[PDB]
Design an enzyme around this catalytic site. Structure first.
Site, PDB file in Angstrom:
ATOM      1  CD  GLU A   1       4.873 -25.454  43.006  1.00  0.00           C
ATOM      2  OE1 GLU A   1       6.116 -25.645  43.159  1.00  0.00           O
ATOM      3  OE2 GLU A   1       4.276 -25.638  41.921  1.00  0.00           O
TER       4      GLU A   1
ATOM      5  CG  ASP B   1      16.068 -21.915  33.947  1.00  0.00           C
ATOM      6  OD1 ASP B   1      16.254 -22.025  35.172  1.00  0.00           O
ATOM      7  OD2 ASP B   1      15.077 -21.309  33.496  1.00  0.00           O
TER       8      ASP B   1
ATOM      9  CB  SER C   1      14.886 -19.416  36.596  1.00  0.00           C
ATOM     10  OG  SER C   1      14.510 -20.769  36.682  1.00  0.00           O
TER      11      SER C   1
ATOM     12  CG  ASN D   1      15.111 -23.996  38.777  1.00  0.00           C
ATOM     13  OD1 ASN D   1      14.238 -23.111  38.864  1.00  0.00           O
ATOM     14  ND2 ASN D   1      15.035 -25.090  39.506  1.00  0.00           N
TER      15      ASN D   1
ATOM     16  CG  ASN E   1      11.066 -19.884  37.221  1.00  0.00           C
ATOM     17  OD1 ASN E   1      11.329 -19.295  36.180  1.00  0.00           O
ATOM     18  ND2 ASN E   1      11.854 -20.803  37.745  1.00  0.00           N
TER      19      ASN E   1
ATOM     20  CG  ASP F   1      11.024 -22.824  41.078  1.00  0.00           C
ATOM     21  OD1 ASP F   1      11.158 -22.193  40.003  1.00  0.00           O
ATOM     22  OD2 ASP F   1      10.857 -24.063  41.130  1.00  0.00           O
TER      23      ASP F   1
END
Ligand code: NA
Length: 129
Positions: free
Chosen positions: A35, A48, A50, A46, A59, A52
């Site tokens: 990760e 969208d 969001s 991201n 997230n 991480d």
């Protein structure tokens, strides 16, 4: 701050992750490796809305609050800032919730696509924990 592999393994074990809900320690170290390459400050923002965060790339759409992610959901009840510490307290506590509030470690795309079905204990054997 990047963790060394065994330092992280020891920290994760001392936070209860070795065999947590059927996931041996190696699963968690492998997940962190792919990760975030063990980088507590890793961030992936991201389209969208969001992001991480941290060593386990948790997230923000569901799990932590960063003040800007659509839906403003926060199932771990933490600021996403807490996931970027060299203190892994929040990352661990939240990971435990994620695995309990869903389909296990399938929540982590890197675990699912890189660690699942492998001999994950390879990531910790040399630490001799
Ligand atoms: Na959120």
């Amino acid at each position: 701050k990047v963790f060394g592999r065994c330092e992280l393994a020891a920290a994760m074990k001392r936070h209860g992750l070795d065999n947590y809900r059927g996931y041996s320690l190696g699963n968690w170290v492998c997940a962190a490796k792919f990760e975030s390459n063990f980088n507590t400050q890793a961030t992936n923002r991201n389209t969208d809305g969001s992001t991480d965060y941290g060593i386990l790339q948790i997230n923000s759409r569901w799990w932590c609050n960063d003040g800007r992610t659509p839906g403003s959901r926060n199932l771990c009840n933490i600021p996403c800032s807490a996931l970027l510490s060299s203190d892994i307290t929040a990352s661990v506590n939240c990971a435990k919730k994620i695995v309990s509030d869903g389909n296990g470690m399938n929540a982590w795309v890197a675990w699912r696509n890189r660690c699942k079905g492998t001999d994950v204990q390879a990531w910790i054997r040399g630490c001799r924990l």
